[PDB]
């Protein structure tokens, strides 16, 4: 039995204390591709979000280590990834999980488990939207066309329901220029080392 | 938003040899 008003206020004056954070240092900057670098790619597979499946792209240009001094993700590497859901109305791009990079000269493989982007780094591969309007409307249209020819709302409300049951689908051409946002540090320490010359 | 327009097709009005010089296989 202390005042409720009083307690609520006391509670709102009690913040969640955030923990301070300690800086440290990256262990192998010459042998690491760190979070936030971009891997520019050109898609091998065409893409169509009607049925969930897989995608490939091939690294377009070399990507260097955290300090920019060592080549680590080689141009011409193959990347395999998956597109496992589709798009909704109001969307013109889709989430893409790029899984593994495989250098085909060398055999170096790394699970990057990173998201695909644009060339400018925003999330998802952009594409062309097919709204499937005709298929989403034809039933109601056909039916009502009788109702009309039956003459000289609830249907309409059922129509909209049916209209929403089929999604738009996204297409993107083969060979598109596209990118990957590196989501996690990629450590090449166990694979490459350095020597003169 | 019906369908999908396919990627561009080349224009061949001006067609040209690829090899200005003979390539070499370096193995």
């Amino acid at each position: 039995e202390t005042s409720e008003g009083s307690s609520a206020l006391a509670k709102n004056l009690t913040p969640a204390r955030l923990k301070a954070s300690r800086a440290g240092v990256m262990a192998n900057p010459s042998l690491t591709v760190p979070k936030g670098k971009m891997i520019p790619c050109g898609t091998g597979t065409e893409l169509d979000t009607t049925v969930p499946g897989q995608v490939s792209c091939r690294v377009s240009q070399d990507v260097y280590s955290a300090d920019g001094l060592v080549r680590l993700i080689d141009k011409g590497s193959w990347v395999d990834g998956q597109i496992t859901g589709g798009i909704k109305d109001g969307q013109a791009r889709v989430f893409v999980l790029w899984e593994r990079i495989r250098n085909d000269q060398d055999g170096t493989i790394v699970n990057i488990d990173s998201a695909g982007t644009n060339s400018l780094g925003s999330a998802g591969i952009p594409g062309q939207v097919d709204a499937h309007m005709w298929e989403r409307l034809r039933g109601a249209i056909m039916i009502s066309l009788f109702s009309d020819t039956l003459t000289a709302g609830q249907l309409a409300s059922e129509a909209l329901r049916s209209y929403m049951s089929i999604p738009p689908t996204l297409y993107d051409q083969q060979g598109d220029a596209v990118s990957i946002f590196v989501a996690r540090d990629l450590d090449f320490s166990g694979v490459y080392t350095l020597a003169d010359n | 938003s019906s369908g999908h327009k396919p990627p561009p097709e080349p224009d061949w009005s001006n067609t040209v040899p690829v090899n200005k010089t003979i390539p070499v296989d370096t193995q």
């Binding site: 520019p40 000269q105 060979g175 | 561009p8 001006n14």
Partner: protein, 130 residues
């Protein structure tokens, strides 16, 4: 042996062997120079698309016997990772990156010529069923 695996591997890493064909032509459009190849040729088995050493790698598609543009298999060769060696040979090709495209036509497509019955890319290494 480990030393045997190494010799066979090096030997094999050498065949794009055989009579070569250089008879290739391409569409020429100025907007598309940024993905044009410097060379295209073949072996009658595999086809090489060579780009400038530091150029971005575009992607390559083939026109199949079926009439359709088709995604083939390929690997890069070269110190500069600038040559796409496609694991196949074809009458016609597309080079693509984003909305740039370059048509490439093989004026001496001769399926029928140049097979090797070895089970590898090379005339000198053979695949053996254990």
């Amino acid at each position: 042996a480990a030393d045997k695996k190494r010799i066979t591997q090096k030997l094999k890493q050498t065949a794009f062997a055989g009579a070569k064909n250089y008879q290739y032509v391409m569409s020429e459009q100025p907007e598309m120079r940024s993905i044009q190849p410097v060379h295209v040729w073949d072996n009658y088995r595999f086809t090489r698309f060579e780009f400038p050493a530091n150029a971005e790698l575009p992607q390559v598609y083939m026109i199949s016997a079926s009439g359709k543009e088709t995604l083939p298999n390929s690997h890069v060769v070269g110190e500069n990772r600038n040559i796409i060696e496609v694991e196949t040979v074809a009458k016609e090709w597309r080079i693509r990156l984003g909305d740039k495209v370059v048509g490439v036509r093989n004026n001496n497509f001769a399926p029928g010529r140049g097979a090797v019955a070895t089970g590898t890319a090379s005339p000198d290494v053979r695949r053996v069923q254990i």
